[PDB]
Design a protein around this ligand. Structure first.
Ligand SMILES: *[C@@H]1O[C@H](CO)[C@@H](O[C@@H]2O[C@H](CO)[C@@H](O)[C@H](O)[C@@H]2O)[C@H](O)[C@H]1NC(C)=O
Ligand SMILES: *[C@@H]1O[C@H](CO)[C@@H](O[C@@H]2O[C@H](CO)[C@@H](O)[C@H](O)[C@@H]2O)[C@H](O)[C@H]1NC(C)=O
Ligand SMILES: *[C@@H]1O[C@H](CO)[C@@H](O[C@@H]2O[C@H](CO)[C@@H](O)[C@H](O)[C@@H]2O)[C@H](O)[C@H]1NC(C)=O
Ligand SMILES: *[C@@H]1O[C@H](CO)[C@@H](O[C@@H]2O[C@H](CO)[C@@H](O)[C@H](O)[C@@H]2O)[C@H](O)[C@H]1NC(C)=O
Ligand SMILES: *[C@@H]1O[C@H](CO)[C@@H](O[C@@H]2O[C@H](CO)[C@@H](O)[C@H](O)[C@@H]2O)[C@H](O)[C@H]1NC(C)=O
Ligand SMILES: *[C@@H]1O[C@H](CO)[C@@H](O)[C@H](O)[C@H]1NC(C)=O
Ligand SMILES: *[C@@H]1O[C@H](CO)[C@@H](O)[C@H](O)[C@H]1NC(C)=O
Ligand SMILES: *[C@@H]1O[C@H](CO)[C@@H](O)[C@H](O)[C@H]1NC(C)=O
Ligand SMILES: *[C@@H]1O[C@H](CO)[C@@H](O)[C@H](O)[C@H]1NC(C)=O
Ligand SMILES: *[C@@H]1O[C@H](CO)[C@@H](O)[C@H](O)[C@H]1NC(C)=O
Ligand SMILES: *[C@@H]1O[C@H](CO)[C@@H](O)[C@H](O)[C@H]1NC(C)=O
Ligand SMILES: *[C@@H]1O[C@H](CO)[C@@H](O)[C@H](O)[C@H]1NC(C)=O
Ligand SMILES: *[C@@H]1O[C@H](CO)[C@@H](O)[C@H](O)[C@H]1NC(C)=O
Ligand SMILES: *[C@@H]1O[C@H](CO)[C@@H](O)[C@H](O)[C@H]1NC(C)=O
Ligand SMILES: *[C@@H]1O[C@H](CO)[C@@H](O)[C@H](O)[C@H]1NC(C)=O
Ligand SMILES: *[C@@H]1O[C@H](CO)[C@@H](O)[C@H](O)[C@H]1NC(C)=O
Lengths: 177, 621, 338, 48, 49, 48, 39
């Protein structure tokens, strides 16, 4: 770009004109090209700061998802994250999140606690689920019904404060033996 | 490479006037001419250029023959049929290879298509030619590059254009170039394979902004659209009084510099042709204003300080100057915005036996601050004497501009009058002679209200202009309302339909159809503007009635609104996305479908637990 | 948390040389120096749109609340949409829109009433007079509320499952129990003080709305962003009245007063001043857009963690042991209810 | 980890025109090009 | 940095030249220093971000 | 003097660099050479 | 609008000398004078 000068070529203006005015055109080229270069450097600074933010994000992603299991949902890809594998890419990295995603589900029934004898039973870990006729205990993210037992549940309550409680019998492996 | 250039070109799908030959009209020449002709062997010899085509203005002749050309710049008289009868001031002849190539494959099937383009930028006449063995179509359509042949420095005012014929016992195709922006696709060999005009269609114009020949799917901000004022109203003072400039110049006793007679020019119309008339001009150095365009300005107050002074002091008078006169007699303000005028007057300030009437000061206790008169008779002190008188060490302040009809150039009685203007925001009383047109409201129109040039839509207002109020503004300091000088009413000022054009298109590898957006403007205004042909964009996208959709993000033209909901393909804005969907294919606009409408079965005691699971491997980059 | 800023598409030719052919010709002598500016502003607009998408469109399926609203005694009617209101926005949301005033809506098509302004034309008409427009965001403030409602119905009816895969219904008391189990307190404690926790939840919902009301400005960040953008635009438009060391500050009277080959110097002085001011504006907008991008990425992470699940990181999802977080749409931003 | 930088509050009027009235007059013709700068540094200090 | 003017001392060039032209060198110094301060403020904003 | 750093003043186009033989396909009217950024790339020898 | 101006303005809470009449002193003029009278 001429930037308002006679010509845009330094070896042209120098070899065609004599300093007096000339310098003027060379100073015009200076104040054009230096400002253009400053624009370039400022844009590069912006872009490099953004890339630095993205790189810190990538480094934290590596340190969490790859070097361990990350409990933060949706951080290491969609779903319950399991592990990740890094891969090198030009000027960047590519992650392969391996995530556990649930599948076919069914309405069953559920109750917050089961009252056997004046006492409310709550699941140690999992969900109180009912086929529809026989109450069961299971996991949270996978259906695995198990017979209700005094080890699968912990008891604390009076069968009169918990709303939604249901009547059922819990078994103990101790009375039999 | 896809180099883009801005040069005089024949617009794509422009109009070439097709003629016949069985008398030879003169065609106007302006910004170059494209020429093409299909002839069996030869029926056209050359072309002649120039102005008035007579023996008063230099002309041109580009006649050819079997073996060479006859380029010459001459002042031929006429032929009315040996093609000229005058060679008086006719030099700069030129002879080189002929311009016409004709080849046949043992058959006259070739009409030898001859494409020519001429132009006269800064003289340096340029001729470009390219002969394509004629195909079935006379002026067909396939691309054909045009190569230069000669370029030699003509340097004459080419305005008219004519052609020459042959003898014997459907051609002549002529077009005109205007300045446009072109994008050209350069072949690997360096030739030109495809070119696209950036003023033809939305896809072409975008193509000329994403600098490529493939516009991929998406929406691209390209340019802006602006309505063009159909009219141009100027409103100037109700009076048409000629200024007393004549009396300022027809004076006989222009006061000397030490007492600069300052006149006042107000409530009048300044026509400076009378200034030119009473002026054998020698020095018309205007500083704040170009002297040529002095009749198109409105000034608040005009000052005419007149004084007769020597020759070199004419060069002395200028802002930021110095000298015995410029420092103690008449200092112009540095920020002077006006004109000074000097014309020789040896007939009124001279006589036999001498004339010592005029005066000037070389002795002042200090400098004269700009625009100040120091008429006073006080003897300058030297040393420390309170002396009051003339002689040595006691100098009389002002000396004499003695004038007799015999000096040299620098010492004759030059007559000097300076014009000082006040070109600021104020109700002007002095303007140039112009015809106050009528007033048109609710229409984009260039306005020149009392010298305030601009463009926009005017209308009535319910403002409360105080009697002295003249202008309007906002916290941004831009002229908003201007009181009518000849009706004393308040008129607002608006932008002339400013917006921004974005073109929605799918990939050109898929289709060529496009959808145009005019940003943040109701289509009712662009519809009437398009129907009035006052829109800045030249590409006129089709409007079938079904292709108009006032969005919240502007208004859409070229796409039909479909009430269905789909995933966004091309975001337009305000929840509206357009996509290329089958009917058999077209461009439609629709509202966002944020996702599949789903309802959960939440209940007091109903739970969903998966009986199975899947392992999914996504990617993140 | 701010999510986006006003999208601007300042145009070189009109901003710097109001419909002046000689001025545009002399601007062409600076090359595509400002095609960079148009490209940068387009990038800012696209980045803001992507920021809104990242923050809010975190669910592919738009869920709806059950027709009945009895969540174990928990009262939520302050955060789900209100059918009676035409905008279909929650009462918490409405205060947010009523406490943030936008200088330039953008989706107004204000052309046509600058003539009808009668009084002195306002900031928007002034900006339109010199080529600085505001593009409207791709997602409207209405369907953004739809996204917020979808996220809300996903949390209260399906827990955190819908943030991973299919939305599995689960009773709200049970989700409360599981979140409690997530912070090391037995689920039973909830099942004996469900009534007390429901009353406390209802009281806090009511008090936080009043806290965000009677306050002078608790939305200080969003209003600060809007004020920053409006003030940047005002400083941009105000430089057009600056002489920049020339005879006058208006292209139209400069061309109408001086002949071309002397008005060239003055016009070049104006070009140098105005391009430098425009570069200032574009660089500052780039910096603020990077800041807003960082804030919006923080907002998206906060949504994906606190909303679509329980976050163990202390003091991230508000002060105290985190249980849930209910998002709410705000003008050019998001507001969380931890 | 860095937490803050030095808070600077440069002033255009002196930095460009050392106690010079005509230079202040000349700078005034550049518009509010320096109110923006003082605002930017002040905002940076507040942000620190 | 003289920035292409007579001198880099404002107090010097005001007393050594008369306003009309001085104004030109003062404007040159103005546009030099102001652009330098603009670069400084942009870099400081980047560092602050 | 090819394959060597040399100051060239080709038909008024001055510059610096190294010249050598090329296999371009210059059309007869072509005289100069350039790139997408319009940097003088090829010069036809006016006396060869 | 809150326009800001720089011109010759009488300073707020400045000195205004109050006269009487019943000889007509000449007063200095500098940067303009503010005149007020009730009668
Ligand atoms: C309740 O859950 C029971 C699981 O123990 C299911 O009962 C089964 O029934 C078969 C006979 O149909 C028995 O042979 C088996 O041992 C088991 O008890 C029962 O299907 C389920 N109820 C419903 C409604 O699905
Ligand atoms: C669960 O079973 C309890 C006894 O095994 C029931 O308690 C009874 O409640 C009735 C009144 O509802 C009393 O009249 C009776 O004496 C006994 O206390 C209890 O109701 C039952 N609950 C459910 C939900 O079935
Ligand atoms: C400069 O000389 C002019 C010519 O005499 C004066 O202008 C005119 O003077 C005549 C005298 O009869 C008036 O009739 C006429 O209206 C006009 O004023 C002008 O006054 C004079 N100015 C000074 C400052 O001396
Ligand atoms: C859980 O889901 C798996 C795939 O999502 C099922 O595996 C499938 O098994 C069938 C044969 O039964 C194959 O044809 C198929 O390719 C796939 O491997 C799996 O059966 C399923 N389990 C249950 C209990 O539903
Ligand atoms: C859930 O919370 C709502 C808060 O808006 C309750 O609405 C209230 O309705 C009463 C009138 O019954 C109003 O006076 C009050 O201002 C408020 O709008 C709603 O009743 C409540 N519902 C339940 C079941 O708790
Ligand atoms: C549970 O029942 C409801 C009521 O019909 C139904 O809408 C929902 O899809 C069911 N969920 C299942 C079967 O997982
Ligand atoms: C064409 O005209 C030139 C100039 O007179 C002449 O030298 C040449 O022989 C001509 N060629 C013909 C007549 O074929
Ligand atoms: C021929 O015409 C040119 C063009 O105006 C002119 O400069 C030249 O003096 C003329 N030759 C004469 C008059 O002898
Ligand atoms: C005609 O061409 C000559 C060539 O220099 C030029 O001097 C003259 O100005 C042109 N005519 C007009 C009206 O410009
Ligand atoms: C003075 O007026 C006469 C009257 O026609 C005119 O001829 C003459 O040119 C005028 N002189 C000046 C200097 O205006
Ligand atoms: C302008 O002049 C005409 C004719 O003298 C008159 O009818 C009209 O009222 C005038 N208008 C104003 C505003 O003075
Ligand atoms: C824009 O919308 C319609 C269509 O043009 C019409 O009401 C008017 O032109 C505009 N409306 C408003 C409120 O400005
Ligand atoms: C179909 O579109 C028209 C407008 O094009 C709209 O009025 C109508 O309500 C739409 N129908 C449905 C079912 O959405
Ligand atoms: C849940 O229980 C409440 C209170 O007993 C009742 O109003 C509501 O209808 C019940 N809903 C279902 C689906 O059973
Ligand atoms: C240049 O001119 C010389 C002298 O006649 C000749 O020997 C040589 O072949 C010419 N070369 C070209 C490329 O014209
Ligand atoms: C006004 O004049 C009186 C009397 O000289 C003096 O006491 C007072 O301070 C003056 N006003 C101010 C603001 O100084």
């Amino acid at each position: 770009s001429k930037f308002g000068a006679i010509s845009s070529v330094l070896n042209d203006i120098l070899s065609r004109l004599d300093p007096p005015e000339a310098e003027v055109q060379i100073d015009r080229l200076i104040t054009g090209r230096l400002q253009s270069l400053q624009t370039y450097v400022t844009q590069q600074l912006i872009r490099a700061a953004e890339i630095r933010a993205s790189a810190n994000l990538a480094a934290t992603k590596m340190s969490e998802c790859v070097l361990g299991q990350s409990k933060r949902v949706d951080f290491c890809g969609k779903g319950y994250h399991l592990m990740s594998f890094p891969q090198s890419a030009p000027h960047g990295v590519v992650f392969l999140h391996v995530t556990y995603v649930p599948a076919q589900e069914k309405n069953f029934t559920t109750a917050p606690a089961i009252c056997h004898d004046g006492k409310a039973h709550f699941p140690r870990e999992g969900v109180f689920v009912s086929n529809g006729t026989h109450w069961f205990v299971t996991q949270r993210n996978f259906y695995e019904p198990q017979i209700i037992t005094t080890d699968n549940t912990f008891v604390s309550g009076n069968c009169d404060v918990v709303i939604g409680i249901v009547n059922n019998t819990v078994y103990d492996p101790l009375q039999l033996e | 490479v896809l180099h883009l250039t801005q040069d005089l070109f024949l617009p794509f799908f422009s109009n070439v006037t097709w003629f016949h030959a069985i008398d030879n009209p003169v065609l106007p020449f302006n910004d170059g001419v494209y020429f093409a002709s299909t002839e069996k062997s030869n029926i056209i010899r050359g072309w002649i250029f120039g102005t008035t085509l007579d023996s008063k203005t230099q002309s041109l002749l580009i006649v050819n023959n079997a073996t060479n050309v006859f380029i010459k710049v001459c002042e031929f008289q006429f032929c009315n049929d040996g093609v000229y009868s005058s060679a008086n001031n006719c030099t700069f002849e030129y002879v080189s290879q002929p311009f016409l190539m004709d080849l046949e494959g043992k058959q006259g099937n070739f009409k030898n298509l001859r494409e020519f383009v001429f132009k006269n930028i800064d003289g340096y006449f340029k001729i470009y030619s390219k002969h394509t063995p004629i195909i079935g179509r006379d002026f067909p359509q396939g691309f054909s590059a045009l190569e230069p042949l000669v370029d030699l420095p003509i340097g004459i005012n080419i305005t008219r254009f004519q052609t020459l014929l042959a003898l014997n016992r459907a051609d002549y195709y002529v077009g005109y170039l205007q300045p446009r922006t072109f994008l050209l696709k350069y072949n690997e060999n360096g030739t030109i394979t495809d070119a696209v005009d950036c003023a033809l269609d939305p896809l072409s114009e975008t193509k000329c902004t994403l600098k490529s020949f493939t516009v991929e799917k998406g929406i691209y901000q390209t340019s802006n659209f602006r309505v063009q004022p159909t009219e141009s109203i100027v409103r100037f003072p109700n009076v048409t009084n000629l200024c007393p400039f004549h009396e300022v110049f027809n004076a006989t006793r222009f006061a000397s510099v030490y007492a600069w007679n300052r006149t006042r020019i107000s409530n009048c119309v300044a026509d400076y042709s009378v200034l030119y008339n009473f002026a054998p001009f020698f020095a018309f150095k205007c500083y704040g204003v170009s002297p040529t365009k002095l009749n198109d300005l409105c000034f608040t107050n005009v000052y005419a300080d007149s004084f007769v002074i020597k020759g070199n002091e004419v060069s002395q008078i200028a802002p930021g100057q110095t000298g015995n006169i410029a420092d103690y007699n008449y200092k112009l303000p540095d920020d002077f915005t006006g004109c000074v005028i000097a014309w020789n007057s040896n007939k009124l300030d001279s006589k036999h036996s001498g004339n010592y009437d005029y005066w000037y000061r070389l002795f002042r206790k200090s400098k004269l601050k700009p625009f100040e008169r120091d008429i006073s008779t006080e003897i300058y002190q030297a040393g420390n004497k309170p002396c009051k008188g003339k002689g040595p060490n006691c100098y009389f302040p002002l000396q004499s501009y003695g004038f007799r009809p015999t000096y040299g150039v620098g010492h004759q009685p030059y007559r000097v009058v300076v014009l000082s203007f006040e070109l600021l925001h104020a109700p002007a009383t002095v303007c140039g002679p112009k015809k106050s047109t009528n007033l048109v409201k609710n229409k984009c129109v260039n306005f020149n209200f009392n010298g305030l040039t601009g463009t926009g839509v005017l209308t009535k207002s319910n403002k409360k202009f105080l009697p002295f109020q003249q202008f309007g503004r906002d916290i941004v300091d831009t002229t908003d309302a201007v009181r009518d000088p000849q009706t004393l009413e308040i008129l607002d000022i608006t932008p002339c339909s400013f917006g921004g054009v974005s073109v929605i298109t799918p990939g050109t590898n898929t289709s060529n159809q496009v959808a145009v957006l005019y940003q943040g403007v109701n289509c009712t205004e662009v519809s009437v503007a398009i129907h009035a042909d006052q829109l800045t964009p030249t590409w006129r996208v089709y409007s079938t009635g079904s292709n108009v959709f006032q969005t919240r993000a502007g208004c859409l033209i070229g796409a039909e609104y479909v009430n269905n909901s789909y995933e966004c393909d091309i975001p337009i804005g305000a929840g509206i996305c357009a996509s290329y969907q089958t009917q058999s294919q077209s461009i439609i606009a629709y509202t966002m479908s944020l996702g599949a409408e789903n309802s959960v079965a939440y209940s007091n005691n109903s739970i969903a637990i998966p009986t199975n699971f899947t392992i999914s491997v996504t990617t993140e980059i | 948390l701010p999510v986006s800023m006003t999208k601007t598409s300042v145009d070189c030719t009109m901003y710097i040389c109001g419909d002046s052919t000689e001025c545009s010709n002399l601007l062409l002598q600076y090359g595509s120096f400002c095609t960079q500016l148009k490209r940068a502003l387009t990038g800012i607009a696209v980045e803001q749109d992507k920021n809104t998408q990242e923050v809010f469109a975190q669910v592919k399926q738009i869920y709806k609340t059950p027709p009945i609203k009895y969540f174990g005694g928990f009262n939520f009617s302050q955060i789900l949409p209100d059918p009676s209101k035409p905008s279909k926005r929650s009462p918490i949301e409405d205060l947010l829109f009523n406490k943030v005033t936008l200088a330039d809506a953008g989706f107004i098509k204000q052309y046509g009433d600058c003539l009808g302004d009668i009084a002195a034309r306002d900031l928007i008409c002034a900006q339109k007079f010199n080529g600085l427009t505001v593009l409207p965001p791709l997602l409207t403030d209405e369907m953004i509320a739809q996204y917020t409602s979808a996220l809300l119905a996903g949390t209260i009816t399906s827990g955190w499952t819908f943030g991973a895969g299919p939305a599995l219904q689960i009773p709200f008391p049970m989700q409360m129990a599981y979140r409690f189990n997530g912070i090391g307190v037995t689920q039973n404690v909830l099942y004996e003080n469900q009534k007390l926790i429901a009353n406390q939840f209802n009281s806090a919902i009511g008090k936080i709305q009043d806290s965000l009301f009677s306050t002078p400005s608790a939305l200080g960040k969003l209003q600060d962003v809007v004020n920053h953008n409006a003030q940047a635009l005002n400083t941009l438009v105000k430089q057009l009245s600056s002489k920049f060391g020339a005879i006058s500050s208006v292209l139209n009277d400069i061309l109408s007063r001086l002949d071309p080959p002397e008005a060239e110097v003055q016009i070049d002085r104006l070009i140098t001043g105005r391009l430098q001011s425009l570069q200032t504006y574009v660089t500052q907008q780039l910096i603020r857009a990077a800041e807003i991008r960082a804030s919006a990425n923080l907002a998206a992470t906060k949504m994906s963690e606190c909303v679509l699940g329980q976050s163990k990181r202390v003091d991230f999802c508000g002060k105290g042991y985190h249980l849930m977080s209910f998002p709410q749409s705000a003008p050019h931003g998001v507001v969380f209810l931890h």
